[PDB]
């Protein structure tokens, strides 16, 4: 309705810069495969948990027939893995989490199939094979990035080792702002996001602010200039691990 | 320099993001009206001395000249109005005050000038015409930022008048922190500029974000959620007027 509802009528639940927004509250169902999206029309939640009613079955069906055959094959018991981005469920999937409690209770009441977490499993499980995993993921310039990355994190070693057995509360809290500051430029997110509405640009903005950040830290730090209201500014904005320790940085490896 | 010099001699001179940026060194002169700036000539400040010491007894024959024209014509001393840009001396025109004070030393020995401040004018004069000044300037959509404008000008004028008496100090504080808002996106210099490398960007980014400091503090202050950490942030950054009292709103006009 954030794009559908009259100005007027609308504006104090959009953007205070008067740009339309999603509002969460939403009337249509997805219609059809058009690409016409005018044609859509109005969402019925009876119809849908009449969907999540037969996908549930579906998926059931296809985990019991997939059990029996591994089953059949293995001699053991197979745990199917299946992981999920959890905004999938409720999200960009409104029925998501509807979906996810049909399929437990059908799960449930299964005669082929249990429900396990993954620490049952291991406190569990008698036979399992020793392995080496091979080097891998899920998976799916711009270089002036990585060598701030490169030059940020052997300085964060570097000084994290010399300041190892200091006293001063000062220093600690501008070590401490640091890993922070390097923590934050790390995220995935700001470099192969899954940013929905992300676009890679509040991202490299991201990374670079983080960057800026802990290079002007450096800076005070290195020539006796800390100054204590940035550095209060910093860990007021950027306040994410409020019992981290510099120290972590300065262990031993390999 | 800072265009010219090896990128590892160069670099912690300019900006910490790599990018080439201005020094203050800089050894070329003008040298010709070539498009060709690669064709520039090293910079002899004996030579630029000495067109300053034509140009200063250019400008005083021009000014004597025009002096004696006026006199004959008048009757009385003319004097003549002289206005610059302060950075057109010494920084667009790096000899500008070399200019100045020769200027000034001419004028001095000059038998049909006098230099004069504003002050001493005001101070001698005798016989001055009554009259009244036309509305004018010395002149050189986009109105999502008028409508802010008028609105916060508005809003600023009811809470100065509402909250006269007050004797809170928080609520004061937040006053005086708005009304800063609103003078610092009412700067000049971010709507039509004399903004050197500026560019209209920096400018209206700057609007909005001092719209938006605003904005944020009307909405505390009128629903008694004021955020005294954020405002002491804008109190840090936005420090302009410590003086500043909230209650020069609430004046009368007319």
């Known amino acids: 309705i954030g794009f559908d509802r009259e100005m007027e009528y609308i504006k104090d639940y959009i953007d205070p810069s008067g740009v339309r927004i999603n509002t969460g509250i939403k009337y249509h169902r997805i219609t059809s495969k058009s690409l016409d999206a005018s044609q859509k029309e109005y969402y019925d939640i009876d119809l849908a948990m009449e969907a999540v009613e037969e996908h549930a079955r579906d998926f059931l069906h296809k985990k019991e027939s997939q059990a029996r055959r591994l089953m059949d094959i293995?001699?053991?018991?197979?745990?199917?893995?299946?992981?999920?981005?959890?905004?999938?469920?409720?999200?960009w999937w409104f029925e998501g989490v509807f979906f996810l409690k049909r399929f437990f209770e059908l799960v449930n009441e299964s005669k082929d199939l249990?429900?396990?977490?993954?620490?049952?499993?291991?406190?569990?499980?008698?036979?399992?094979?020793?392995?080496t995993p091979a080097d891998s993921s899920w998976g799916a310039t711009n270089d002036w990035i990585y060598r701030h990355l490169h030059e940020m994190i052997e300085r964060m070693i570097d000084l994290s080792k010399k300041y190892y057995n200091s006293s001063d509360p000062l220093v600690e809290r501008v070590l401490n702002q640091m890993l922070r500051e390097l923590f934050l430029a790390q995220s995935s997110d700001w470099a192969f996001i899954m940013t929905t509405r992300t676009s890679?640009?509040?991202?490299?903005?991201?990374?670079?602010?983080?960057?800026?950040?802990?290079?002007?830290?450096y800076d005070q730090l290195v020539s006796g200039r800390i100054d204590e209201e940035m550095l209060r500014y910093y860990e007021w904005t950027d306040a994410i691990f409020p019992e981290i320790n510099f120290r972590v940085m300065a262990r031993d490896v390999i």
């Open 200 to 217: 890679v640009q509040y991202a490299e903005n991201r990374t670079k602010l983080h960057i800026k950040r802990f290079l002007n830290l």
């Open 74 to 91: 293995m001699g053991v018991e197979p745990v199917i893995v299946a992981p999920f981005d959890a905004e999938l469920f409720g999200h």
């Open 114 to 131: 249990k429900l396990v977490t993954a620490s049952e499993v291991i406190d569990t499980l008698e036979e399992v094979q020793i392995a």
